[PDB]
Design a binder for this molecule. Structure first.
Ligand SMILES: C[C@]12CC[C@H](O)C[C@@]1(O)CC[C@H]1[C@@H]2CC[C@]2(C)[C@@H](C3=CC(=O)OC3)CC[C@]12O
Ligand SMILES: O=c1ccn([C@@H]2O[C@H](COP(=O)(O)OP(=O)(O)O)[C@@H](O)[C@H]2O)c(=O)[nH]1
Length: 421
């Protein structure tokens, strides 16, 4: 077999779409080794089914306390320790042939090439948002805005780096650095499909031979509480459930959590709300145990792909991370957009104004219950919500074609697989 190594940035929004690509490639007969940090592996609860090997490297460092310092420490430790790991893997058959690494770690290309491997950069954000990082690197823009093949943007629609305060400068450099060595990359992979963003993919394809391979999602390494979640959803009728999740990193204040809580209660809809276990203690005092009980399931993590695929889910209140955006679109699920920072602001603009499968909430800097309640009504009940559902069903059909035989993403994964020879 041809042996592929995969190195995500250590966060679930980066591990998961690479994991899904790895599962596809394992299906085609490739051997996969996934490289994770010690800290990621502590959270890994199921892996036997994948048949992929998992190797761990030290964390190398928490990162938000000083982004400029700890990202550089993580980079140096990752260079050193993936070099050591590759050296050990070169004592075993089949020898590794290619390293697919997260696009935010472009210096890993140098480790791939120094070890005799091909290097594939795996972008976990769409071409439209990645275009912004390239223009930042060219100096065309810095942290109304007109960029080629993107809709007119307000300042609020640009990737939100200002929210990171002191880390703002370091975060901006990191995002731009994703393109610093793109001419030397052996394979440029994007987790998107052409029909989603035809013009910016075409523009990008005139500069480098990019491979759009998305959605990579078709399944989980972490605890998803699958049985409880799917049994609860199986008790719900079609189009009755609001799925609420702010992803794996974003943290809402107690003041914001209460507005969300009251909005979901006052809405009188059924809701499944992922509140991560370290965020639980900010919910109103009796919410999880009694108040949420008549209409809601409050759970620390869920099988988001299966939840979004469930016919009972009427819409998705989301922070607009790209995986959650792409998953809802491929599932035909319209959204309520509550972006927090980074690319989420840009994603929310694309959801609402380009793909037209969601609405956005207006802050007052706290989003109020009645605003969230208005958005629920717009989606669940209003005629606007029916058009958003019809647009989402159209995108699902195009994503379906993309990953099926003859589709753009299936062909690109086939071209990549065949290039490995
Ligand atoms: C800064 C912050 C904020 C949430 C936490 O509380 C504290 C964090 O340091 C955790 C790290 C995270 C996040 C912010 C997003 C990042 C830039 C993210 C991305 C890399 C990329 O290519 O695409 C986005 C991973 C690294 C990141 O800086
Ligand atoms: O209860 C949950 C919530 C999220 N996810 C997954 O976690 C990832 C979140 O990625 P995203 O890009 O949306 O935002 P981030 O967590 O990076 O901020 C996605 O794979 C979701 O499907 C999940 O499996 N269960």
């Amino acid at each position: 077999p041809i042996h592929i190594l995969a190195f995500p940035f250590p966060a679930k929004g980066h591990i998961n779409p690479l994991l899904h690509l790895c599962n596809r490639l394992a299906s085609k007969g490739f051997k996969i080794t996934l490289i994770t940090t010690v800290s990621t592996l502590k959270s890994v609860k199921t892996s036997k089914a994948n048949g992929i090997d998992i190797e761990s490297i030290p964390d190398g460092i928490v990162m938000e306390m000083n982004m400029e310092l700890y990202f550089k420490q993580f980079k140096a430790s990752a260079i050193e320790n993936t070099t050591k790991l590759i050296q050990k893997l070169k004592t075993k058959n089949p020898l590794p042939k290619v390293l697919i690494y997260d696009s935010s770690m472009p210096w890993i290309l140098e480790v791939a090439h120094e070890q005799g491997l091909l290097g594939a950069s795996f972008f976990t954000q769409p071409c439209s948002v990645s275009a912004i990082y390239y223009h930042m690197l060219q100096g065309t823009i810095k942290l109304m805005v007109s960029l080629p093949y993107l809709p007119l943007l307000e300042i609020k629609d640009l990737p939100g780096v200002q929210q990171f305060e002191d880390n703002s400068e370091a975060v901006a450099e990191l995002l731009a650095d994703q393109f610093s060595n793109i001419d030397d990359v052996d394979y440029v992979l994007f987790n998107t499909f052409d029909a989603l963003e035809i013009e910016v993919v075409n523009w990008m394809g005139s500069k480098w031979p990019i491979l759009t391979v998305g959605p990579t999602a078709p399944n989980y390494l972490f605890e998803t509480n699958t049985e409880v979640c799917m049994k609860w959803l199986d008790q719900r009728e079609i189009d009755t459930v609001i799925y609420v999740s702010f992803g794996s990193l974003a943290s809402l204040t107690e003041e914001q959590m209460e507005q969300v809580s009251q909005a979901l209660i006052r809405s009188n809809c059924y809701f499944l709300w992922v509140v991560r276990e370290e965020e639980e203690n900010k919910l109103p005092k009796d919410f999880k145990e009694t108040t949420s009980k008549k209409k809601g399931l409050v759970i620390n993590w869920c099988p988001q792909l299966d939840v979004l695929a469930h016919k009972s889910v009427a819409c998705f209140m989301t922070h607009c991370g790209w995986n959650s955006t792409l998953e809802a679109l491929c599932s035909g699920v319209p959204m309520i957009c509550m972006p927090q920072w980074a690319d989420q602001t840009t994603n929310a603009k694309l959801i609402e104004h380009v793909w037209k499968i969601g609405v956005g909430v207006n802050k007052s800097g706290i989003v109020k219950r009645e605003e969230i309640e208005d958005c629920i009504r717009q989606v669940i009940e209003s005629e606007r919500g029916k058009e958003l559902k019809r647009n989402a069903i159209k995108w699902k059909e195009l994503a379906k074609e993309a990953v099926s035989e003859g589709g753009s993403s299936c062909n690109n994964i086939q071209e990549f697989s065949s290039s490995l020879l």
